[PDB]
Amino acid sequence: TENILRKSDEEIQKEITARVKALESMLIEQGILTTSMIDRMAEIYENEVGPHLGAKVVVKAWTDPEFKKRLLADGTEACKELGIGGLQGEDMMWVENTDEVHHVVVCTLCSCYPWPVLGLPPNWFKEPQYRSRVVREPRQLLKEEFGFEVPPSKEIKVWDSSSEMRFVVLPQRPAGTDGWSEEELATLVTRESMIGVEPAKAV
Amino acid sequence: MNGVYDVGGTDGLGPINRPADEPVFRAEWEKVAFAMFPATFRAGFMGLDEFAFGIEQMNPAEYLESPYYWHWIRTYIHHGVRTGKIDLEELERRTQYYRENPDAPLPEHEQKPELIEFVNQAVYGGLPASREVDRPPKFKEGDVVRFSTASPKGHARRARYVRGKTGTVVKHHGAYIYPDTAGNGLGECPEHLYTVRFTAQELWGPEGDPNSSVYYDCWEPYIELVDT
């Protein structure tokens, strides 16, 4: 929304860039930051860690009922079976969508998100518009913003992640996917489906 | 405290901005701000709860409309000054230098294998906040409890929309670092952690969805018993 007080995006970016470079120069001289450290962090979260890891978990639960049980019992330890875990996902609890219950995850006070299974969160998840409203009008938010119609008789459980526990949605397996391989099924799992703002892909 | 970042339930913040596809990092400065998190953590600037408290002390209008990773920069400076590791006047002079000379080089420095070692270990091994404590959990699944009305000015995880509300304990998770001490420089002082379910009608009155509830994480001091 326009704010008559606000500078242009180019001017804000120019100012932030100078401020960041100045701070970067000082932490470099302190010996606590280096160019290789910066490049390593960026490489991991650009090309290594992302929602394809979460998709592997979802498809295993869809095709392995015993794994699904372990996943819902202890999400951290179950994901460890696939070598998935670590920073900002040390404690994970998965919640299962059913015909009777729909789940959606948020941090109203912060931006907490399960990095090992989803990578870094999209900007909208961290911004005040989603965070403020999803705890108050989740049914209307899902419909208006994500085109996702949850019938009024179906319960919506909103998980406001106010601790280091990370909540992840196990979406329902779409109909018409009988006997698909895991690689076929993963094509239907999205980052949005593991937040709860959309279902898994149709067809 | 009771700051603008405590946005749960706030109306009028606008439509969600969701570009059909965006990159992980929108500009080079965001990559730098991101990598400063492990760097300042290792150097003793702050822990994760203190990190949050720094963001919470921002100018609220700047918080509401600035890029997310700018919030990170503000917390590094906050804690850099607090601990005496960042001289503000030198930072201000270097900012002007980089305004006028944006392509000027960064300081000469040696690379440090130990920092790559730290990054790799932190990323794959994590930084777990779970802790063992000598006390047993006060509460258990099915207990009906009431959230505290306390309104501390320091760091806490007590969203205003849940204060004083009645809910049911859903799960005990074990004990964890406690934000009300950790974020204020007072130590881990771990407390048991629970998820508590609040109905939308309890939270929002009649305007609440009759078939929705919010599940909110409560450290043990945040809640007191109503009915076992």
A112 is in an annotated binding site: yes
Cβ A48 vs Cβ A117: under 8 Å: no
Q: How many contacts does A have with B, using Cβ atoms within 8 A? A: 267
For CA atoms B216, B217, B221, B223, give the dihedral sign.
positive
Q: B86 φ, ψ to 5°?
A: -120, 120
66-95 in chain A: CB under 8 A from chain B: 85-91, 93
**d(C-alpha A198, C-alpha A177), whole Å:** 18
Q: What letters, b where the CB count within 10 A reaches 16 and e where it falls short, cover B36-64?
A: bbbbbbbbebbbbbbbbbbbbebeeeebb
Cβ B143 vs Cβ B167: under 8 Å: no
**d(C-alpha A3, C-alpha B65), whole Å:** 10
- Residue in A45, A53, A104, A110 with CA at minimum distance from that of residue A82: A53
**d(C-alpha B53, C-alpha B50), whole Å:** 5
Decide if B20 touches A, using CB distance below 8 A: no
Residue B146's DSSP bridge partners are B166, B224
- Name residue, tokens 């258990």: B140
Q: B219 φ, ψ to 5°?
A: -75, 155
Q: Give how far Cα B157 sits from Cα of B91, B136, B151, Å.
A: 32, 22, 11
Mutate to test the interface with A, among B53, B214, B219, B222 (most CBs of A within 10 A): B214
By C-alpha distance, the chain B residue nearest A1 is B14
**d(C-alpha B141, C-alpha B163), whole Å:** 20
**d(C-alpha A21, C-alpha A19), whole Å:** 6
Inter-chain CB proximity A16 and B29 less than 8 Å = yes
Q: B156 φ, ψ to 5°?
A: -165, 175
Q: What letters, b where the CB count within 10 A reaches 16 and e where it falls short, cover B185-199?
A: eeeebbbbbbbbbbb
Inter-chain CB proximity A37 and B219 less than 8 Å = no
Topology, domain A1-203: Nitrile Hydratase; Chain A (3.90.330)
Inter-chain CB proximity A129 and B68 less than 8 Å = no
Known catalytic residue at A25: no
Q: What count of residues does chain B have?
A: 228
Residue A70 CB coordination number (10 Å): 16
By what method was this entry solved?
X-ray
Known catalytic residue at A111: yes
DSSP chain A: ---TTPPPHHHHHHHHHHHHHHHHHHHHHTTS--HHHHHHHHHIIIIISSHHHHHHHHHHHHH-HHHHHHHHH-HHHHHHTTT---TT-SSEEEEE--SSEEEEEE-SSS----HHHH-SPPHHHHSHHHHHHHTT-HHHHHHHHH-----TTSEEEEEE--SS-EEEEEPPPPTT-TT--HHHHHTT--HHHHHTSSPSPP-
CB-based contacts of B127, cutoff 8 Å, min separation 6: A87, A90, B41, B48
Residue A29 CB coordination number (10 Å): 14
Q: Which of A8, A36, A112, A161 is catalytic?
A: A112
Cβ B220 vs Cβ B206: under 8 Å: no
* Interior angle at CA B122, CA B118 and CA B125, nearest 5: 125
**d(C-alpha A109, C-alpha B1), whole Å:** 11
- Residues forming CATH 1.10.472.20 domain(s) in chain B: 28-125
Q: Which of A8, A25, A36, A110 is catalytic?
A: A110
Decide if A32 touches B, using CB distance below 8 A: yes
- Name residue, tokens 């100012």: A15
Inter-chain CB proximity B215 and A160 less than 8 Å = yes
- Residue in A121, A169, A166 with CA at minimum distance from that of residue A148: A169
Topology, domain B28-125: Cyclin A; domain 1 (1.10.472)
Residue B50 Cα to chain centre, angstroms: 8
Residue B15 CB coordination number (10 Å): 10
- Residue in B126, B128, B127, B131 with CA at minimum distance from that of residue B175: B131
- Residue in A193, A122, A5 with CA at minimum distance from that of residue B18: A122
Please give the single-letter amino acid code of residue B5: Y
- Residue in B171, B183, B186 with CA at minimum distance from that of residue B216: B171
A181 is in an annotated binding site: no
**d(C-alpha A151, C-alpha A101), whole Å:** 11
List of chain B residues whose C-beta atoms are within 8 Å of the C-beta of residue A164 = 48, 129-130, 176-177
Known catalytic residue at A79: no
Residue A25 CB coordination number (10 Å): 22
Decide if B149 touches A, using CB distance below 8 A: no
Q: B81 φ, ψ to 5°?
A: -75, -40
Residue A67 CB coordination number (10 Å): 16
By C-alpha distance, the chain A residue nearest B214 is A158
Mutate to test the interface with B, among A82, A160, A195 (most CBs of B within 10 A): A160
Cβ B186 vs Cβ A133: under 8 Å: no
- Residue in B178, B186, B172 with CA at minimum distance from that of residue B136: B172
Q: Give how far Cα B170 sits from Cα of B40, B138, B158, Å.
A: 36, 14, 18
Inter-chain CB proximity B215 and A157 less than 8 Å = yes
- Name residue, tokens 């939308």: B200
**d(C-alpha A85, C-alpha A83), whole Å:** 7
Residue B176 CB coordination number (10 Å): 23
Q: This structure's resolution (angstroms)?
A: 1.5
DSSP-derived pairing of the beta strands B130-131 and B166-176: antiparallel
DSSP-derived pairing of the beta strands B223-227 and B191-199: unpaired
Query: In this structure, what token pair is assigned to residue B216?
Result: 């909110």
Decide if B70 touches A, using CB distance below 8 A: yes
DSSP chain B: ---TT--TT---S------S---S-SSHHHHHHHHHHHHHHHTTS--HHHHHHHHHTS-HHHHHHS-HHHHHHHHHHHHHHHTT-S-HHHHHHHHHHHHH-TTPPPPP----HHHHHHHHHHHHH----EE--SSPPS--TT-EEEE-----SS-----GGGTT-EEEEEEEEEEE--HHHHTTTS----EEEEEEEEEHHHHHGGGS-TTEEEEEEEEGGGEEEEE-
CB-based contacts of B213, cutoff 8 Å, min separation 6: A155, A157, A158, B197, B198, B199, B200
Query: Domain B131-227 carries which CATH code?
Result: 2.30.30.50
Q: What count of residues does chain A have?
A: 203
